[PDB]
Amino acid sequence: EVQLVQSGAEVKKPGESLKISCKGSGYSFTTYWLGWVRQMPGKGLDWIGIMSPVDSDIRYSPSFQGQVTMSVDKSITTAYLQWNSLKASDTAMYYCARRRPGQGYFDFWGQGTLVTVSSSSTKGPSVFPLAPSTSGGTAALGCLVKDYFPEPVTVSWNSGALTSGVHTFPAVLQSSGLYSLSSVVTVPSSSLGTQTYICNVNHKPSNTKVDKRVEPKS
């Protein structure tokens, strides 16, 4: 019931300003303190700070003191984290979390807001089909998601109906500065021709939403 829902991934150029949000529900908003934690790609967790919803009280760590700005909107039970001028070093995942009263650790966590600050132009991916292969056995098929920037991209199969056996690999950064990844599934060869498989690619930053139908060859 306790939920912390955060705004979507942001893509910004250095010098720009940014405001990401966190919406609390399923509990008394004013009774609990809210905090933020940054996590740069591949690295650990950094306590940004903590704040009261009811009044002024705020508590930043040293590294973040006067580098970011926390605030709250009691009327829509939402909290915020805010920069006046982003740097490329700011790109990272940012979690908001609720502080348990009478303690200092974080009760529940938001799902996080990916924040990417860069000068490189946003580029929408192109999606190609990886087609499979008396008969019967295991067949592999997938989708090649080429040349996009920045991360992330998203791949569901049959609109989420196909889950198990699906592998979306970590994106690889090519010399072109663009990203490429592949998503694949293994299925009984029996289904080839009877069931129909579609991968659903979504690269938010470039409003790219592609449904590609992967059917056997010839």
Partner 1 sequence: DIQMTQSPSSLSASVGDRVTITCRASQGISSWLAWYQQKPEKAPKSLIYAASSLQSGVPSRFSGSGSGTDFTLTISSLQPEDFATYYCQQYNIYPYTFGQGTKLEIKRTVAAPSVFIFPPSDEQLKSGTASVVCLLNNFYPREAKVQWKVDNALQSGNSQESVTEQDSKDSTYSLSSTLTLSKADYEKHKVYACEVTHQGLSSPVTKSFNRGEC
Beta bridge partners of 143: 129, 183
Site for partner 1 in 3-42 (CB under 8 A): 37
Chain breaks in the chain (C to N over 2.5 A) after: 133
Closer CB to partner 1, residue 29 or residue 36?
Answer: 36
Using CB under 8 A as the binding rule, whether residue 105 contacts partner 1 is answered as yes
Closer CB to partner 1, residue 55 or residue 62?
Answer: 62
For the bound state, the minimum distance from the C-beta of residue 105 to partner 1, rounded and expressed in Å, comes to 4
Closer CB to partner 1, residue 12 or residue 140?
Answer: 140
Closer CB to partner 1, residue 47 or residue 158?
Answer: 47
What residue type is 69 in one-letter code? T
User: What are the φ/ψ torsions at residue 200 (nearest 5 degrees)?
Assistant: -115, 95
* CA angle centred on 152, ends 147 and 156, rounded to 5°: 95
Site for partner 1 in 161-180 (CB under 8 A): 167, 169-172, 174, 180
Q: Could you give the 3-state DSSP secondary structure of residue 124? A: coil
| Site size toward partner 1, by CB under 8 A | 47
User: What are the φ/ψ torsions at residue 190 (nearest 5 degrees)?
Assistant: -55, -40
Using CB under 8 A as the binding rule, whether residue 109 contacts partner 1 is answered as yes
How far apart, in whole angstroms, are the C-alpha atoms of residue 133 and residue 140? 8
Q: Which residue has the tokens 């989708």?
A: 143
Would you tell me how many other CB atoms lie within 10 Å of the CB of residue 196? Answer: 11
Using CB under 8 A as the binding rule, whether residue 188 contacts partner 1 is answered as no
Closer CB to partner 1, residue 45 or residue 54?
Answer: 45
Q: One symbol per residue from 39 to 78: x for binding partner 1 (CB under 8 A), - otherwise; what is it?
A: -----xxxx-xx--------xxxx----------------
Closer CB to partner 1, residue 55 or residue 217?
Answer: 217
Binds partner 1 (CB under 8 A): choice among 23, 52, 108, 202: 108
Using CB under 8 A as the binding rule, whether residue 106 contacts partner 1 is answered as yes
Strands 172-173 and 92-99: unpaired
How far apart, in whole angstroms, are the C-alpha atoms of residue 40 and residue 53? 26
Intra-chain end-to-end CA distance of the chain, in Å: 51
Q: List residues near partner 1 by CB under 8 A.
A: 37, 44-47, 49-50, 59-62, 95, 97, 100, 103-112, 126, 128-131, 138, 140, 142, 144, 146, 167, 169-172, 174, 180-182, 184, 186, 217-218
